[PDB]
Ligand binder design. Structure first.
Ligand SMILES: N[C@@H](Cc1c[nH]c[nH+]1)C(=O)O
Ligand SMILES: [Mg+2]
Ligand code: NI
Length: 493
C-alpha cells in the first residue's frame, strides 16, 4: 500500500451514504459529511459547522451561528440554507429518516442571515446538540429529489474531511482528501473503506498488507503478538452484548420465564473465560453513561432461583428433566451472526446454561444479513452509544419503536412496557440534568422488573494498525466499535 493511501476495514456497510439514514452502523457518513457539532478525544461537545450557539433559558430556542468558510465537495458554499433544508428533511416523515426521533420535537427553523439559524422546539430536547453532529445535507442537490431513493445516496456530496470517489458494492468505498477542509488539513490523500465482516479474513489481509488497520476480535488478537508491522490499541466502548427476547414467542412473552432465564447465566464466568477481561459484566444499557444510577438491582447467577421461578410460572418437569407446560416443552431458538465468533460463542454458552436448568434451546448460526432477527425466538444482540443516553435507548426500547410497527424502529424484540415508555420520553424532554438522571433511573429500574434482554457484557475493542501510521487517537467507542475512525483525517504514514 502506497504512503498516500489509507486502507481500513469495517464490518458494517450501508446502502445509502446519507446522514438522514444513519443507524450508527457505519464509518463512511462521518467521512463525507460534517454536522454543526462534533466530539473530541474526551467525547466533549465541540463546534464543527457551527462556530457557536446560544440556548434559551427554557431550552426551547436554539440560536446557531455558522462558519462562513465552508465549502461543499462540489465547490458550492455551505450556508444557512443547507441547515434549514437538512433539519426539515430529517423531520419530514415522508423521508423515513432513521434519525427522525432526534428531530421530532422541532417547531420551526428560521434563517435570520446566511450565517445565523434559529431553531425553536415544542418541548425541551437536551440531546439536540449531540443530534446535530450527524451531518448536514446540500440543499442545491437534494431540494427537488426524493431523499429516500435519490442517486445522491450512492454519489454523496458533503462537507466532511473526505470526498466520495467511487463505490464497489460489497467490496470497498474509495475517498480522496477534501482539499478545502476548514477544520484541519486532511493528511492522507487517499482513503479506502474496505468491507470485511469476517474477522479471520480481516486478520489475514492485515498480515498480507492489503489493509492498514481494522478492529480485530479479541479471540484473534494473539495472532498479532510479536508481529512488528502492527501496533495494538485497546479501546473502551459503550457497546454491550445481550440476548434479545422476542416477546411474540409463546414462552418468552411470560415475565417469569425471562426472569428465570436471567438467573441461569454466570456472566462473570463468561467475561473471564470467553473475553479474557477485555470486558465487564453488563446489567443494563447505560453503564458507561452519566445517566447510570449506580444503584440498581441485578439478576444474580442462581440456577435454583431460576428453576423455582419456572415452576411458579406453571411449568412441570418431565421424565427427561426438561420443563413442560400444558403438554408443550419450553423450547425456543437462539440466533447468532455466524460471522461474529463472540456472538456464536456467547449463544453456545447461553444454551448450556439454559439446559442445566432444564430449558431446551437450539443455537442457529447464520451470516449477518441472511435472516430477519426481529422474527426469531431470541437473538444475540448488541447496542450502545457514548453520546446522549437517549440515542440507543429510545429507538431500542420505547414501544412506538417496535420494528414490526415502525420501519425505522430498533425495537426488534417487540418490547412494550408502559414505565419504560414514560421514563424515556420524560428523560429526553427534561432540561435539568439531575431530573434526567432520575428518569433514566426509573428506566433502568423498569428494565429490571420487566427484562427485554439478558444483558451480558460491555466490550472493549482492539484496533490493529500499520505501525507506520501517525496521528491515531483513541476514545470511547460506540456499537460495533463505530467511531474508531473519528480523527482519520489526522492519520498519516
Ligand atoms: N445493532 C444490532 C442489530 C444488527 C444487525 N446487524 C448489525 N447490527 C446488533 O448488533 O445486534
Ligand atoms: Mg462529524
Ligand atoms: Ni448492530
Amino acid at each position: 500500500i502506497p504512503k498516500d493511501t489509507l486502507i481500513i476495514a469495517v464490518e458494517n456497510e450501508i446502502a445509502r451514504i446519507n446522514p438522514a439514514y444513519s443507524e450508527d452502523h457505519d464509518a463512511v457518513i462521518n467521512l463525507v459529511f460534517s454536522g454543526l457539532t462534533r466530539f473530541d478525544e474526551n467525547m466533549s461537545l465541540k463546534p464543527d459547522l457551527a462556530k457557536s450557539w446560544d440556548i434559551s433559558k427554557d431550552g426551547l430556542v436554539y440560536d446557531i451561528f455558522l462558519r462562513d468558510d465552508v465549502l461543499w465537495h462540489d465547490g458550492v458554499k455551505f450556508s444557512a440554507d443547507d441547515v434549514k433544508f437538512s433539519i426539515e428533511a430529517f423531520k419530514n416523515p415522508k423521508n423515513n429518516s432513521s434519525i427522525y426521533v432526534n428531530f421530532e420535537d422541532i417547531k420551526s427553523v428560521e434563517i435570520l442571515n446566511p450565517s445565523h439559524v434559529k431553531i425553536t422546539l415544542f418541548k425541551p430536547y437536551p440531546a439536540f446538540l449531540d443530534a446535530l453532529s450527524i451531518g448536514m445535507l446540500p440543499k442545491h442537490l437534494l431540494e427537488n429529489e426524493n431523499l429516500n431513493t435519490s442517486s445522491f445516496n450512492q454519489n454523496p456530496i458533503g462537507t466532511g474531511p473526505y470526498k466520495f470517489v467511487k463505490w464497489k458494492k460489497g467490496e470497498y468505498v474509495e475517498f480522496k482528501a477534501n482539499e478545502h477542509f476548514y477544520l484541519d488539513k486532511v493528511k492522507t490523500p487517499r482513503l479506502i473503506i474496505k468491507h470485511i465482516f469476517d474477522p479471520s479474513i480481516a486478520s489475514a489481509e492485515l498480515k498480507n498488507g492489503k489493509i492498514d488497520a481494522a478492529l480485530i476480535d479479541v479471540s484473534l488478537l494473539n495472532i498479532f503478538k510479536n508481529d512488528e508491522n502492527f501496533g495494538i490499541l485497546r479501546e473502551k466502548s459503550a457497546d454491550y452484548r445481550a440476548l434479545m427476547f422476542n416477546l411474540d414467542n409463546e414462552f418468552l412473552k411470560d415475565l417469569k420465564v425471562r426472569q428465570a432465564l436471567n438467573y441461569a447465566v454466570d456472566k462473570e464466568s463468561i467475561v473471564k473465560n470467553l473475553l479474557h477481561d477485555y470486558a465487564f459484566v453488563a446489567n443494563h444499557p447505560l453503564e458507561r453513561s452519566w445517566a447510570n444510577s449506580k444503584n440498581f438491582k441485578i439478576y444474580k447467577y442462581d440456577p435454583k432461583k431460576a428453576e423455582d421461578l419456572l415452576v411458579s410460572a406453571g411449568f412441570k418437569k418431565n421424565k427427561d428433566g426438561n420443563f413442560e407446560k400444558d403438554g408443550k416443552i419450553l423450547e425456543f431458538e437462539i440466533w447468532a451472526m455466524s460471522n461474529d465468533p463472540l456472538r456464536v460463542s456467547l449463544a453456545g454458552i447461553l444454551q448450556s446454561e439454559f439446559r442445566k436448568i432444564g430449558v431446551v434451546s437450539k443455537v442457529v448460526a447464520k451470516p449477518a444479513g441472511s435472516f430477519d432477527y426481529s422474527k426469531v425466538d431470541s437473538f444475540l444482540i448488541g447496542w450502545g452509544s457514548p453520546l446522549d443516553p437517549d440515542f440507543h435507548t429510545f429507538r431500542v426500547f420505547e414501544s412506538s419503536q417496535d420494528s414490526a410497527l415502525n420501519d425505522e424502529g430498533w425495537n426488534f424484540g417487540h418490547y412494550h412496557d408502559k414505565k419504560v415508555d414514560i421514563a424515556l420520553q420524560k428523560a429526553r424532554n427534561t432540561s435539568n440534568l439531575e431530573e434526567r438522571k432520575k428518569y433514566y433511573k426509573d428506566f433502568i429500574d423498569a428494565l429490571y422488573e420487566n427484562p427485554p434482554f439478558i444483558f451480558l457484557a460491555y466490550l472493549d475493542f482492539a484496533l490493529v494498525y500499520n505501525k507506520d501510521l501517525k496521528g491515531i487517537k483513541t476514545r470511547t467507542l460506540g456499537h460495533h466499535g463505530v467511531g474508531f475512525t473519528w480523527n482519520v483525517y489526522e492519520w498519516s504514514k
